[PDB]
Amino acid sequence: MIERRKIAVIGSGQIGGNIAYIVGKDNLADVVLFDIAEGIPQGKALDITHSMVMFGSTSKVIGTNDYADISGSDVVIITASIPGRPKDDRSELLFGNARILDSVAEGVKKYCPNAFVICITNPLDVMVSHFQKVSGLPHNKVCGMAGVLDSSRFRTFIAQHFGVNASDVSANVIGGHGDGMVPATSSVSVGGVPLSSFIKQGLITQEQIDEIVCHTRIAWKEVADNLKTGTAYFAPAAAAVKMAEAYLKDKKAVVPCSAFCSNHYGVKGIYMGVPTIIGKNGVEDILELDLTPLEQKLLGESINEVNTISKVLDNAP
Amino acid sequence: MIERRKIAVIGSGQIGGNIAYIVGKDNLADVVLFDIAEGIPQGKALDITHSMVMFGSTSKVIGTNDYADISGSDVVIITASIPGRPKDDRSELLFGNARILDSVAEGVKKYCPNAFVICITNPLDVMVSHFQKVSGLPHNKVCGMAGVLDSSRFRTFIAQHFGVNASDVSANVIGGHGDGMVPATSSVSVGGVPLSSFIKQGLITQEQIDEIVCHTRIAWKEVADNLKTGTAYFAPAAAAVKMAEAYLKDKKAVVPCSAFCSNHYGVKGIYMGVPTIIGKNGVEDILELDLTPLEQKLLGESINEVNTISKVLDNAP
Amino acid sequence: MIERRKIAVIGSGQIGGNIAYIVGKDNLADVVLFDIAEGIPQGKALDITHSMVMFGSTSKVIGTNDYADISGSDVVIITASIPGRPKDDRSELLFGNARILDSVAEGVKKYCPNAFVICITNPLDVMVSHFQKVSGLPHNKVCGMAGVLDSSRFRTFIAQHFGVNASDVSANVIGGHGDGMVPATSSVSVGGVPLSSFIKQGLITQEQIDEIVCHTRIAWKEVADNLKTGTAYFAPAAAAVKMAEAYLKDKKAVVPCSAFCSNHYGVKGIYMGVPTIIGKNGVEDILELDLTPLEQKLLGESINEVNTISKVLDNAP
Amino acid sequence: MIERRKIAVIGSGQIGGNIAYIVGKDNLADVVLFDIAEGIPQGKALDITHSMVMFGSTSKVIGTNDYADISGSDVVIITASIPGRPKDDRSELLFGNARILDSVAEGVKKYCPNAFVICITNPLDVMVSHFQKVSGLPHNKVCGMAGVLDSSRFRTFIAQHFGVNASDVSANVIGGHGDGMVPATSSVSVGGVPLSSFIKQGLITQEQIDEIVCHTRIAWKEVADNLKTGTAYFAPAAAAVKMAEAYLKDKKAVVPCSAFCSNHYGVKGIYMGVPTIIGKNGVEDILELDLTPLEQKLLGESINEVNTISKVLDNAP
């Protein structure tokens, strides 16, 4: 019997509200906006409900403070976080958000244990690992949104240099969602043309490539410093929706995200940004990029960052 | 010559940013986000720019505080306003927002005087009238967003009662965007069936229609009371986009909006909520609904409330 | 566990192929194109498959001659028919297509008895009734596409007169899909304005309305006489997809279609064109239009046509 | 002034009608369907017109046999051809179709000389060269659809092997649209990973790549053999629309098409399959792929086959 698709958004702040907005606009699923703050999800849900007829969507969007309402959710997107932007590093939110995810894990485990969980809450890679351990959900049904955002930024900056449609730039960011993230320049192409060729042709310099890599790594601060009252939320929301689409429509889409990687990239069981295939069984495979020796080292340094913050969490107050 | 469509969003707050998000997502046009507040429009533009590749759109979205950047704009959407939500009525911000729109009027007059202008700034009907006077733009190239939002709520509430797709409800709200808005119950139809028939069939009572009419007029408060930090912004943004679409696509679409009504509804030249036809020449026509004596009276009261508040603004002490 | 939606198209001729094309384009479902003609569905499926990447859809489209391949189909759309356009009346195909539907009913009953069946095969209303009797599927899970096509034509012609967007014209055609079909002028509106008002305003004449009614009734011949090699197929395909959308997305959409009507319009168990609500349980309700005495008589004459052709079939060779 | 976009489709057969269908569905532009055959374009235009309200599009679609009706066309797409499918090679219809394109050239030269012209008529590369010469239109405003169709098939077949979304495969086909097309295997990547890496990882063999390359070159026959009444038309139509989109939306999109290559791939001025950048000024650039010695040679052979057949047409007996 046909049932409507259902996405639960845990945390109805800046990102959560836009996710509901976009999901509703696309008629991808019904949405449940969950939050502990009185009135917030209810007001956003009512507002978004009014827009549905304008978009020609019959998606239902409700606000709640009750985990019972996320029962039967196909996808759970976790945006829940302590207030205030990070000053210097995403891991400043580590202790507070780990405790939030403990609570979220109990709600999910009880009401929708078969859901595909997409974590957004920072510090992303550590939070995803934490959520999986506490919730007990299968590794392939729990992942983190990060790579799509980082890679979209990487692709956009390359596209802005060459003056071409970013959809025609292929480019990946891998590793942890932090300073150590690795935009893999070696496997970048624009319409099938690699960066090495554009260098020979005189259309881009290595220094320009290095600036694009740097820009990608610290892009979050550029947005956050301009917004002042918080961090990026339009693109992170859009990225979460693309990931939800891949699962709900069984796309077998190649998606860079934080996934449990245990037989690739020289690691033996860790959550980190890698190119995955996402479909109706969640994370169905991981693909191995052709990394240079330098890039393999940078990835190693990224893995170290993830392990370091993970150990800090294991010795929390 | 093919040129990209260009939409200028004046005021990059809650509604302005959402308009930019959706316009870009749909690839309806390039977007210029204008604001006086430092950082805000640049930050949102950068964030939204990163999402464009996720949506498969090539729309360019930039942020600015320089009116020279809105030149050649096909459409201008004005959300600029002084801070703080309305208490009981929308017409408390009259003098401040009139002052803001003077600057916008001078900006548009200089850099894009052939633009279709859609005002959203409250108090809507007076602001629209004020902008046209100060700007000197043709009456048919200046209107206000209100009816689409109110009609959308009206359609939504009717649809919830009957348990049907709101897209299959036809319903209009006319008059001023305030407590004296007139949801024309006589114009209502659900897939060809009118409310009178549904009463006779016993599928809706007169008391329920009264509640729906009331809900529509006070719906803005229900949202604001729950958001607590401001007024509705997801649905108002979407409404403005639908109006922009009608213009840019030359749809000849029926759009309830605040337009210069010169020879309909017993008025000689006033900006108020009416069902217009919008195409490439702006407001191209106005339709005449079959209003009941009661609805004629309610609209008459609505017309007076506009002129009352309009004359107060003319008498600048 | 998330499974892809599946639509089976029985008959991969002119309409069938476009249905697959559009369903695939929209990524509404996977498609199985069934036909008895060797090579035809396979070639169309391969061709349409190549277009999927161009549309950004991951829909799978296959061609088959084996009813086993329609197992687990959520929706079955029946386009199967004997060759050649009708000369004067759709019922010329009655005897041949009744026998085809006997075969289709066995395939559906065995492999996907829980499917929502949308019949297109002419003579529509009699074929739908025939399919339901032979297949044994519930009345609410078997219907015929016709009203959406007839009403879209009716709406288009009205829209073409007034020079407005047809989406803003509300108008229904009811009764049998034949010469006796009833375009209900009484409940037509354009942006909430009834035709009676446009007559008073001098914008349309009753004779012009009568021509639009006639044009609607014989529209099929206008298309067919121009195509020469067959009858209309672009719009009928689009109409079938809208009906499939309503079921698969649980829209509660108001859809004029041939449905089993037993407590409305003065009939006690007959398939005929009526305004329905379609959702995940198929035909979930029928709505009652406000018909004039003249329109009630015309509907009576339509019912007689349907019964007459139905009796002819009951006394087949 | 906002004006509607306008696309003229010259030749309203299998491909032409599908282009009209999709353009209208997407509301990309108004459509003029031109043909010499009586009734055909009028019938399809009327049929497609009825579907517009179903799709929620206001695109106007008309049929004609008068070149004056294609005036002011932003894009012209040429499908006009003599009847009958190709036997073994596409270059059998040279003289007949060259004669047809003379008429189209004179029509476009008179009524819409600033139009972006996309030729589809076979033999593609020679027809494109012929049309530009006879029409006198700028080289950058005239191109041929081929590479998008071939690249789409190439991407699709690669994607089927790896079991991933074809949209996440980057792959180009260059050279002539014939047996000497060159699927550049060296340009292939699946989410950043190249075929060389997949070979090393043991996820694809060299023999399988050879089969995929072969499948791509002969794919047109597989479709034609199954359709039996003609050649592929769903995917070719969609390809032409994607090219029109790139122009009308000013996408700066990477489009493999038959373009005037003057200073790349070792040629001084010839129409052949190359990766172009298409925007509002037509073909705005050409990208240089890193071809292997073998691929350079295969492309060289392809270039000769164009000039061979091109010189045969220059020598009109």
Ligand SMILES: NC(=O)c1ccc[n+]([C@@H]2O[C@H](COP(=O)([O-])OP(=O)(O)OC[C@H]3O[C@@H](n4cnc5c(N)ncnc54)[C@H](O)[C@@H]3O)[C@@H](O)[C@H]2O)c1
């Ligand atoms: N992965 C990424 O790439 C990425 C990108 C941007 C932002 N982020 C992160 O996403 C998170 C959300 O960002 P935002 O701007 O939407 O934050 P926000 O402050 O706007 O929203 C957070 C919401 O979480 C709610 N919340 C707090 N405690 C909760 C609990 N116990 N249960 C449920 N809800 C609770 C709050 O009420 C608030 O509405 C942040 O941690 C941010 O750093 C991640």
Ligand SMILES: NC(=O)c1ccc[n+]([C@@H]2O[C@H](COP(=O)([O-])OP(=O)(O)OC[C@H]3O[C@@H](n4cnc5c(N)ncnc54)[C@H](O)[C@@H]3O)[C@@H](O)[C@H]2O)c1
């Ligand atoms: N018509 C309707 O139905 C409707 C519905 C909802 C809200 N509104 C109204 O729309 C307006 C905007 O709502 P919001 O929530 O986006 O407000 P907001 O406070 O979030 O945004 C207003 C923006 O205007 C900017 N601004 C201030 N002075 C300016 C100037 N001189 N030039 C340019 N920009 C300036 C501010 O920096 C701010 O970013 C309000 O007046 C609100 O009452 C109307």
Ligand SMILES: NC(=O)c1ccc[n+]([C@@H]2O[C@H](COP(=O)([O-])OP(=O)(O)OC[C@H]3O[C@@H](n4cnc5c(N)ncnc54)[C@H](O)[C@@H]3O)[C@@H](O)[C@H]2O)c1
């Ligand atoms: N309901 C409506 O409003 C409406 C509108 C237009 C057309 N139609 C009808 O739809 C039907 C299809 O029209 P079309 O133009 O697509 O016809 P078509 O001739 O192009 O296609 C019919 C297909 O049915 C196949 N077929 C024949 N016998 C079969 C069997 N036993 N099992 C499976 N398939 C079989 C044929 O091989 C052929 O491919 C016609 O009867 C036509 O009158 C209905």
Ligand SMILES: NC(=O)c1ccc[n+]([C@@H]2O[C@H](COP(=O)([O-])OP(=O)(O)OC[C@H]3O[C@@H](n4cnc5c(N)ncnc54)[C@H](O)[C@@H]3O)[C@@H](O)[C@H]2O)c1
């Ligand atoms: N580039 C590619 O990859 C590709 C792929 C498939 C097909 N094709 C080619 O595209 C062309 C069209 O294919 P189709 O299946 O649509 O063919 P079709 O026979 O279905 O349609 C051709 C149309 O051209 C019309 N026509 C004939 N003479 C004309 C004239 N002087 N002016 C205007 N119109 C005229 C005919 O009436 C007919 O409707 C063929 O040449 C085919 O080989 C190219």
